[PDB]
Amino acid sequence: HHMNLHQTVEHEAAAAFAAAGIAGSPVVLQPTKNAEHGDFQINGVMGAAKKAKQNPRELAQKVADALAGNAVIESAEVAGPGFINLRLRHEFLAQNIHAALNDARFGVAKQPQTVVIDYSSPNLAKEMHVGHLRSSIIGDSISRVLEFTGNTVIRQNHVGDWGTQFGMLVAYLVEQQKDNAAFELADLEQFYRAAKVRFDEDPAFADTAREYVVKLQGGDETVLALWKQFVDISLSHAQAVYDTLGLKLRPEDVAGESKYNDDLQPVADDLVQKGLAVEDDGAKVVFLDEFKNEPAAFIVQKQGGGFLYASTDLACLRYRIGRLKAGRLLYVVDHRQALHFEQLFTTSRKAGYLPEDAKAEFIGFGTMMGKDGKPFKTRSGDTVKLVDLLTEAVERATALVKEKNPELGADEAAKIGKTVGIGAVKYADLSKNRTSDYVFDWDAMLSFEGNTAPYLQYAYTRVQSVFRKAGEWDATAPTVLTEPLEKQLAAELLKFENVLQSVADTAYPHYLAAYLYQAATLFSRFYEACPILKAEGASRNSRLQLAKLTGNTLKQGLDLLGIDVLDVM
Ligand SMILES: NC(=[NH2+])NCCC[C@H](N)C(=O)O
Numbered sequence: 001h002h003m004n005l006h007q008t009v010e011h012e013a014a015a016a017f018a019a020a021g022i023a024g025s026p027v028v029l030q031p032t033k034n035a036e037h038g039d040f041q042i043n044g045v046m047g048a049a050k051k052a053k054q055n056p057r058e059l060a061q062k063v064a065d066a067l068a069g070n071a072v073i074e075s076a077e078v079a080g081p082g083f084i085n086l087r088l089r090h091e092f093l094a095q096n097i098h099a100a101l102n103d104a105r106f107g108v109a110k111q112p113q114t115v116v117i118d119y120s121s122p123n124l125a126k127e128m129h130v131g132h133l134r135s136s137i138i139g140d141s142i143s144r145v146l147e148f149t150g151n152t153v154i155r156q157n158h159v160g161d162w163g164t165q166f167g168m169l170v171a172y173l174v175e176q177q178k179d180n181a182a183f184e185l186a187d188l189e190q191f192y193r194a195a196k197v198r199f200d201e202d203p204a205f206a207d208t209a210r211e212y213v214v215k216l217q218g219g220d221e222t223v224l225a226l227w228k229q230f231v232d233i234s235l236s237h238a239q240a241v242y243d244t245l246g247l248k249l250r251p252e253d254v255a256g257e258s259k260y261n262d263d264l265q266p267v268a269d270d271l272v273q274k275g276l277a278v279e280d281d282g283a284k285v286v287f288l289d290e291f292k293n294e295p296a297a298f299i300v301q302k303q304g305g306g307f308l309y310a311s312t313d314l315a316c317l318r319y320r321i322g323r324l325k326a327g328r329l330l331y332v333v334d335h336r337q338a339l340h341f342e343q344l345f346t347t348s349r350k351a352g353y354l355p356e357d358a359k360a361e362f363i364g365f366g367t368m369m370g371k372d373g374k375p376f377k378t379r380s381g382d383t384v385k386l387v388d389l390l391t392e393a394v395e396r397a398t399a400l401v402k403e404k405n406p407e408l409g410a411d412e413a414a415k416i417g418k419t420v421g422i423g424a425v426k427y428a429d430l431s432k433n434r435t436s437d438y439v440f441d442w443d444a445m446l447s448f449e450g451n452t453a454p455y456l457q458y459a460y461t462r463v464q465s466v467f468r469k470a471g472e473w474d475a476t477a478p479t480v481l482t483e484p485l486e487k488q489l490a491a492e493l494l495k496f497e498n499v500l501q502s503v504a505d506t507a508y509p510h511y512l513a514a515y516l517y518q519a520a521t522l523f524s525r526f527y528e529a530c531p532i533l534k535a536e537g538a539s540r541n542s543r544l545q546l547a548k549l550t551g552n553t554l555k556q557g558l559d560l561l562g563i564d565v566l567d568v569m
Contacts, residue, residue, distance in 0.1 A: 045082035110150025123160035161256035167213035263315035397421030427453035
């Protein structure tokens with residue numbers, strides 16, 4: 001009870017191949033670029049013709065002939081040397097639109113892999129930065145799509161909660177609490193800088209900080225409780241941003257780097273025992289011929305015993321495979337760490353930590369930039385505060401929403417403004433290929449036309465306005481499709497499952513954003529060309545069915561991007 005449109009069409013094409021004497025040859029079915037050519041294109045004829053050295057044009061026409069009268073495909077036309085353009089039959093479209101609305105068991109079908117997805121994952125010594133913002137948003141949408149397609153999704157927020165820098169942070173916290181028992185740590189950036197001033201200016205403070213590191217590494221209960229105080233504060237700052245954004249990431253999903261500290265020396269010793277890590281001036285180093293320039297050096301323990309980012313991620317991968325029983329690992333991380341994860345994966349495969357049938361994927365994203373192409377900063381050049389950025393998005397959207405509808409009350413406008421403003425923060429990121437650098441732009445992201453969250457949100461509200469106007473209708477009535485844009489919109493709506501499965505496979509949410517924008521703009525063309533309220537009979541009811549499924553698909557698709565809709569704006 002679903003529609004995998006690609007598979008349904010491929011099945012008919014495969015039968016036509018068999019009827020044409022090329023049974024078992026790959027169909028190589030692809031969607032069409034322009035719907036003026038049809039809905040799908042068969043690309044496999046040239047390859048199939050190679051075996052018998054057959055004439056490919058004649059073979060393509062034989063396949064097309066075998067599709068005459070097909071229930072799914074109403075026309076099959078040869079193009080180029082031996083491509084075949086397929087147009088879906090309107091009765092097939094109508095029946096499956098009807099089913100998507102009325103079959104109570106209809107859904108997006110689901111191979112329940114266990115997927116551990118690592119995202120957001122801020123360093124706790126400072127505030128969350130705009131790179132962590134990208135990871136939070138991109139990872140949250142991927143995680144939503146994976147759940148919706150039936151995977152077992154384990155979110156892990158790999159917070160940076162351990163390291164020598166916490167020595168000066170703990171020492172500075174102690175000083176600040178001695179001078180005020182009501183001490184509030186408002187800004188982690190200012191706190192961090194102030195502690196470094198003390199560490200750089202005061203040798204007695206630096207000695208004190210180094211002693212706290214000793215006690216932290218030693219597990220001193222008293223110093224660990226001070227560490228936990230700081231970590232809990234920093235986590236609360238992150239959680240307030242998560243709450244504002246409306247993520248699916250929860251406190252129970254936190255799994256900080258400190259979790260793996262007892263595994264670091266076992267991993268290092270294991271790699272030495274397997275001959276993968278070797279001694280290099282007292283350090284333990286993994287040399288990888290795979291990353292030669294001379295093989296790349298992947299240091300797993302320093303000369304004096306200290307561990308590294310690489311050490312923690314090796315231990316953590318072992319845990320995610322061996323204890324969480326993950327079949328697929330996704331790391332949603334700034335693109336500048338690509339080499340770290342490539343070396344992590346290669347080392348883990350050689351060590352047996354990552355089995356041959358497990359997948360591990362670096363889900364990289366580009367740098368957030370200002371309009372000058374330089375990394376994103378405030379007008380005065382300072383680090384962007386995420387809480388300020390999100391407040392600004394909501395304030396900006398609230399002003400625009402009041403401009404568009406001056407009859408909104410202040411409280412109604414503010415509620416709409418939150419949905420539009422946060423929605424735009426997410427969509428302006430997610431609608432771009434994650435791997436590109438991203439220029440932040442208030443004017444672009446808050447435009448009510450073009451490819452933006454407000455455009456799609458207001459598109460949903462316009463669908464709801466149609467139903468406020470239409471009166472009684474019957475979603476269960478037989479569906480008829482007679483006009484070109486009726487049929488084009490139906491075919492687009494039936495692609496939803498395939499789009500979502502593509503995002504699950506590739507971890508590119510911008511494919512879903514692109515689909516929703518195409519669907520909304522096509523709905524608008526349909527609405528102009530095929531009057532709904534002026535229609536009568538089956539035409540009226542079928543156009544209302546199309547509008548209802550459009551609304552449902554916009555709402556569901558936006559939800560999987562983390563974006564909400566409103567019945568009224
Ligand atoms: N398993 C991981 N290494 N996840 C990413 C951690 C990102 C790191 N905390 C940073 O701020 O850059």
